Design a protein around this ligand. Structure first.
Ligand SMILES: [Zn+2]
Lengths: 207, 124, 114, 56, 122
RNA sequence: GCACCUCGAUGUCGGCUCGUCGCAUCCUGGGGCUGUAGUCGGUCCCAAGGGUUGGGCUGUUCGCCCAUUAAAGCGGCACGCGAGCUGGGUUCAGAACGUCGUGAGACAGUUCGGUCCCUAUCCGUCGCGGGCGUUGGAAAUUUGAGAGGAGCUGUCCUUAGUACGAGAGGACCGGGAUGGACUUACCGCUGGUGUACCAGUUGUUCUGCCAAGGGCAUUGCUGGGUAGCUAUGUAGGGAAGGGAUAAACGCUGAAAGCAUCUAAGUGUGAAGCCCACCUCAAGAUGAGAUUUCCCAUUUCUUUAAGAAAGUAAGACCCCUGAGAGAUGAUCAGGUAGAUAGGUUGGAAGUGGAAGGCUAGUGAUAGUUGGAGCGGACCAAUACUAAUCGGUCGAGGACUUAAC
RNA sequence: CUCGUUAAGGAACUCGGCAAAAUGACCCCGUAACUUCGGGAGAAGGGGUGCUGACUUCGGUCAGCCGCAGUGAAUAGGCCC
């Protein structure tokens, strides 16, 4: 249905009408452009291809310019597909701007979490330590690997490894304010990801 | 900002020495990590040498090494210049009208006993 | 930074008098007791101020009935109505955390004209 | 922990297939022709970027 | 935050001075208590004479903690002490006098007989 | 009970860390009977999705006690887990008590003390790359065969002091609010840290002296604190639904003129099952789909899916890096340039610089002046360094059919 | 592995406060039961400490000044039943 792509700027505060303080996250989204329309006769399902964030032109190649030429735009940096939206009602060239949402509008928000590197079982999985005194030599370790009988370790025995960097969505957040001349949405709470990272905002699945 | 294999006071000693060299010599051979950290420190000294006043002089004198000479000078005496005196009489007036960027690095070769990549860092 | 300051600019208060940690202050808070609106007053010494923007706060220390009380406020809430400077103090630092372990006469701050 | 069986010639050599050397970007000097590492000074003649550098 | 084996002063006229916390009623593994929360405790130090004698198991409500409370408008309050008031199983003080100042959260939790006798209500 | 197994070695119990499976079910869900008025209960049937607490005393399981909870289940896994921890206990050498023995000594009697080694080859488990394949060479967007996560539950308010009942007492079925434990992100707030940030102060030594500073003493010590990483901080979540079923309950109905849920026909029905929500996924050798980009030299073994050479679209080596990181990979850039350093303004932070002046016998104070300084943060600016270059990379098989 | 700091709580840890943290110098005041009359005893528990000037009988005392902190670093008993 409704849905837009933008970038993450940062967090701030705001007072409401009644005079309550509320933490917020600024998202900036210049106008998105519809590049392609997928149908059942051609593709086998129904969707919409959207682009965001204009790109300098030494940085693209000839196949990309050909794909962006039928829509009369500059080459884009981020291209996603938006599903479950009554097609009609849409055509290549159209611009989706932030006034698609209004204040209220419980929404879903997705991103890619920050990266953290190679991490141990205690930080990565919330596992608890061993004792720090009393003759102990077992501080920061992942536990026993299993029982003796099967002569092997089972799967989903959790260990150390690379942490972060996965996609995550958070459900049922509120739009606090929409500003049109600046292409800005204010969302109540915190979102996943670092600064300048891609963010997607859709109307909520659980309604 | 690059720990360089040293503790906190040995890093400071080593940088204070390598930037007082290159004030005295104007061209030096070193490894590649040290040269980057040093480009930063030396240009911070030159923009105090261009400021000129007493407060700037005493700010620099916390960082430039003291009992070192830099002499190509004799009218008729043994008249010594002090490597802080050179900073304030010679190198500041040289770069008067240039904005930042008073140095440059070139890459040469790995050292024989080490394979450490070496580098020349000079002024103009 | 400048995209955030622009959005939050139109919500900063302009009637805020100048004060430092060390000065004494009367805050004119607002309380809601059921449907009634009413105003309290909270008099004490400013001991903290940590800042930059709409996110600025300060805190005030008081001794009520033999127990010490601290109350932190944002600088720009509309739920305060008045900040009045009563005295000026002579102080040598920014965080007066050493006041929270003294009592009576040892916790005295000298005055100063400004 | 101790090796329970010796390793044969085929498995040793299959381990050792990612254990080689590389000789990366080598170009020809613009001033004197001979080969040299890119973004480095030319060791044969001391010229980098069309000028003389290891001289006074 | 107040947990098992924390010690509280008594802000009451009941004959108790110090109290040791035994449980943090409400839940099944809950850790900490706050301002307006009910507790089970031991009397550790009494006063010579008094309705309440030392060694007794009794209930009390927390006012006045060090790590204090937070209000909806963005403001905070903190005290220099931890204190409690011994309670009579339908929220009435077993004494007749509260000492010292009291947090305003005791209204929302409906200890209205206690908010009548406190000297100051912050 | 037996003595097949292991004596050129298969390390005991409780606790810790990490769990997994059965169901003879401890709670929560659905039911039939009651010596079921209501509120609570007894017992039997279906059900393994999730849940199942902190202390005191003992080396202790076991057990008793205290305070809570919806509840404080019972078993298997070498009575799970010592090349993962502990070594309190049992079972080495010392010493003592009761007791037995002429004695040396002895006791599932007791007491105080008492050495636990290992640099991971193979399979396995968690993460991360290179090679080739997917039948011209490439840049992007994707469907979903499969798979994994998640799955708990309390109190109040209303219906209503209504049904029920002499009274005491007190509902089903609905609607609304707010919690506990657990968990996914994040640094605006409250705090933690913050060894190239600011200030105060002791001893001694150096910059020739005074003033002003540097070195060392755990960062010498003490008071604050930016970015980054963080919880005890802040936001969210387990929402509502559909389908086929278990116990149970039918509707219509004969065999067997009646009766009967069943044989033919036809329904209802659970926290369970398949979807619904989140994440991974075409090496799914059954290797899928859509949009865009690029189009022919030389000798012949013989003309063949032939070899070799230069190229297109595109890619890489090499260099500046960080929102990324063990390395490699990923992402932002390479003068068609803000990629990193420097410079010029700013900010957080500290809290009033140096040099002079004025008032003091002095220690010091006031003033010039919210001063000076300022890692990582914010804008602008080609001043230095991303120079010059090289490498790889298509020419698209055959059969049948319809057009 | 060896070090430094930590909100709120403060032995809830474990066979056992193991290991850490806390006390620590000099001057002054004070100090129980018990006892072989020597002890117990540094019992316990409290106060002072920098810098300038004046007087200093002598040893110190008064007036003033500065900081969160004056044995401003390093070195040095935890105690009780
Ligand atoms: Zn050359």
């Amino acid at each position: 249905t409704k849905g837009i792509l933008g970038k993450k700027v940062g967090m701030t505060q705001i007072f409401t009408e009644s005079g309550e303080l509320i933490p917020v996250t600024v998202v900036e989204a210049t106008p998105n452009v519809v590049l392609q329309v997928k149908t059942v006769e051609t593709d086998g399902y129904e969707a919409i291809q959207v682009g965001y964030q204009d790109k300098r032109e030494v940085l693209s190649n000839k196949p990309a310019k050909g794909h962006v030429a039928k829509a009369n735009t500059a080459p884009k940096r981020f291209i996603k597909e938006f599903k479950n939206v009554e097609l009609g009602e849409y055509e290549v060239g159209k611009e989706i701007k932030v006034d698609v949402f209004q204040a209220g509008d419980v929404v879903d928000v997705t991103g890619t979490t920050k990266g953290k590197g190679f991490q141990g079982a205690i930080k990565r999985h919330g596992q608890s330590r061993g004792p720090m005194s009393h003759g102990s030599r077992y501080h920061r370790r992942p536990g026993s690997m299993g029982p003796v009988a099967p002569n092997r370790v089972f799967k989903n025995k959790r260990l150390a490894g690379r942490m972060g960097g996965d996609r995550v969505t958070i459900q049922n957040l509120e739009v606090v304010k929409v500003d049109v001349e600046r292409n800005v949405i204010l969302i109540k709470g915190n979102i996943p990801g670092a600064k300048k990272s891609l963010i997607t905002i859709k109307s909520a699945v659980k309604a | 900002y690059r720990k360089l294999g040293r503790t906190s006071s040995q890093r400071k000693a080593m940088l204070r020495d390598i930037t007082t060299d290159l004030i005295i010599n104007e061209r030096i051979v070193t490894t590649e990590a040290r040269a980057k950290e040093v480009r930063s420190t030396v240009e911070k000294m030159i923009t105090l040498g261009k400021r000129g006043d007493l407060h700037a002089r005493r700010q620099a004198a916390t960082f430039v090494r003291n009992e070192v000479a830099s002499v190509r000078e004799e009218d008729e005496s043994i008249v010594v210049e002090s490597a802080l005196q050179k900073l304030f009489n010679d190198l500041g007036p040289r770069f008067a009208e240039r904005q930042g960027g008073y140095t440059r690095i070139l890459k040469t070769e790995p050292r024989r006993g080490d394979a450490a990549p070496m580098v020349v860092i000079e002024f103009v | 930074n400048p995209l955030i300051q622009e959005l939050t600019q139109e919500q900063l208060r302009t009637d805020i008098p100048a004060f430092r940690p060390g000065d004494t202050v009367r805050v004119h808070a607002k309380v809601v007791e059921g449907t009634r609106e009413r105003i309290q007053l909270f008099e004490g010494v400013v001991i903290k101020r940590r800042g930059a923007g709409i996110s600025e706060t300060y805190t005030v220390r008081k001794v009520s009935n033999g127990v010490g009380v601290e109350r932190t406020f944002p600088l720009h809430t509309p739920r305060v109505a008045q900040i009045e400077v009563v005295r000026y103090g002579k102080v040598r630092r920014a965080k007066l955390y050493y006041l929270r372990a003294l009592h009576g006469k040892a916790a005295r701050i000298k005055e100063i004209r400004r | 922990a101790v090796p329970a069986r010796r390793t044969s010639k085929a498995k040793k050599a299959k381990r050792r297939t990612h254990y080689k050397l590389t000789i990366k970007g080598l170009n020809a000097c613009s001033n004197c022709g001979e080969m040299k590492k890119s973004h480095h000074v030319c060791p044969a003649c001391g010229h980098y970027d069309g000028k003389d550098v290891m001289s006074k | 935050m107040i947990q098992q084996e924390s010690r509280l002063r008594v802000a009451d006229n009941s004959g108790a001075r110090e109290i040791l916390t035994i449980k943090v009623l409400g839940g099944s593994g809950r850790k900490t208590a706050n301002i307006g929360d009910v507790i089970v405790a031991t009397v550790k130090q009494a006063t010579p004479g008094g309705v309440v004698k030392k060694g007794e198991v009794v209930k009390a409500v927390i006012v006045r903690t060090k790590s204090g409370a937070r209000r909806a408008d963005g403001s905070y309050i903190k005290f220099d002490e931890n204190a409690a008031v011994i309670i009579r199983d339908d929220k009435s003080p077993r004494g007749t006098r509260i000492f010292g100042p009291v947090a305003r959260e005791l209204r929302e939790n409906n200890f209205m007989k206690i908010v009548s006798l406190a000297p100051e209500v912050l």
